[PDB]
Design a protein around this nucleic acid. Sequence first.
RNA 1: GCGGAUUUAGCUCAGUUGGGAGAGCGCCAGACUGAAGAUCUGGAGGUCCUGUGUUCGAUCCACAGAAUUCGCACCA
Lengths: 501, 71
Amino acid sequence: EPRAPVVTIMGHVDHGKTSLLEYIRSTKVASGEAGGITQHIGAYHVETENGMITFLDTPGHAAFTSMRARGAQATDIVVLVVAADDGVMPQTIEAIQHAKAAQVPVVVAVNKIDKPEADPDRVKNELSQYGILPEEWGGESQFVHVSAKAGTGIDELLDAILLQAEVLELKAVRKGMASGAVIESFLDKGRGPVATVLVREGTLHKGDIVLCGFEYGRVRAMRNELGQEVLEAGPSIPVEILGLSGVPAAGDEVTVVRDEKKAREVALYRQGKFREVKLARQQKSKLENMFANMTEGEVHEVNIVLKADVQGSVEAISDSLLKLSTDEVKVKIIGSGVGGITETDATLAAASNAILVGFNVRADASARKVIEAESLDLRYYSVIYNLIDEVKAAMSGMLSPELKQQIIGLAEVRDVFKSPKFGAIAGCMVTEGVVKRHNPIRVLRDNVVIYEGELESLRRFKDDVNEVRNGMECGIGVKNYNDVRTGDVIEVFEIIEIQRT
Amino acid sequence: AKEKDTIRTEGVVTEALPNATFRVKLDSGPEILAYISGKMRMHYIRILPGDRVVVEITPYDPTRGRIVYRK
RNA sequence: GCGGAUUUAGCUCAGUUGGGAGAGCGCCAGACUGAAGAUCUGGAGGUCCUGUGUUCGAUCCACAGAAUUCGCACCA
């Protein structure tokens, strides 16, 4: 009759959420203090009246708000992981805000007590230390100085959750309709399209009708009476692949079998409403206003790709990244090979789509060979940024070195001996300045400053040059007459306005 | 049904490209690919590489336009 | 620079008996045609490069000058 006191590991990033869980798991594998316990995809057990204590392996990118329920939080007791050297941070106060609103009794785990200067560490013992005192009481919370890697302070932490877990909420409830999310939309060997689920609160029955979210819209499906609808992982005894169960409870992982669930999406609710139709219209409606005035310019957008082991985790991180205002591209299921090339196709235009940003998914052997190129980055935790910085360095690296030509400045050129005339392709040596194309040519200051011609095209050996300086000696093409001679000193005409620079 | 998000902004002609296509520099900003209208091609009208023309631009494609008025 | 050629109607050119200023085209009109076109006809349309001189008289000859063009000469 007594169920599991649902607990979640809340706090700031890199404070010791995953590492505290790795020690409660290391003493679970070890004999004496525990033993042969059942494996769940992210949960453990119950108080002195049954097993151990259920720690929910928090949604992939510290979401916690997904672990909600019908009215409040899906968690009974909660454990807040804070750092000893840092103190209370902005994500720790966001954790206290979701703790007082859902009315869930919290315990504070002040992690990394092995990090402060000159502190002797006794492995796996009980601790007695103080620190962050202005934020504790009996009306507030009980603080315990723990070390996730060493294991000290864990004996009083599991005891502090026990003095807080003696409630009636482990029996009575579960009555309301099942609120949760799926895990994956895959194909089984003994059946067709199967769907594993994570249920936050409530009970699913063997003949329960559940509304699910597809690519198009809202379509419901009855849980198959013929065959096995509720399929849990068979207990430690070898028989058939899975086993039939009747009614799963709050905090259970179960593989469901229904009818048409082929185009059923990733990140859907176990009460459902999803579409790609709205997100395509919401993006097109804001892009139609941005392209009605934009009959002219450019700049532009985002990326990010989410994929998880659980959808109670995908839906969680999507809602948490939409809180940080970082938009998403793909939330589908598959690896790479054909995804690594579509990533390299969109890097040519704007490098803002240059990354195949993976998470909890396995990278293929055929994919590893196409990731060998550096132009594309591969992430297995997931974010962006580096993207809009790559295209910024692309256009800014080509606009600055392209300045050299124009402006009628001073330049003198002397025509060499025995060089042809018609459309005057004559060999000429530059004396001073930079003689450019389109620059006007004049006669000597000894005579009158009359218009002799203008430079057509300059040619140094083989190369067609625009600017000739110092004394390069090239084949100058110019529109001249008998006004030009061989060995004459020509000066470029500074128009009286451009003369005074 | 026809959408009314079509603009009638002016512009000056720049380059004379083949098959009745021009470069047309807009008085608003940059330049579009602007072709001559089916109304103007039937009434002939020879456009020189430097005339003032009104462009019928569609919001779906910024690079494409259409010459409506003659001079 | 020297030497030569050329300089007449809007254009293109003829015009040495020193005495008439002219042709084609064009332009305008007429005739005609339905009409327009062509064609035919008719008209207007000149500092004959400019000045001076020669002569009875000068587009026509002499002298001087200017302009065009060609050859030649000259050229850091």
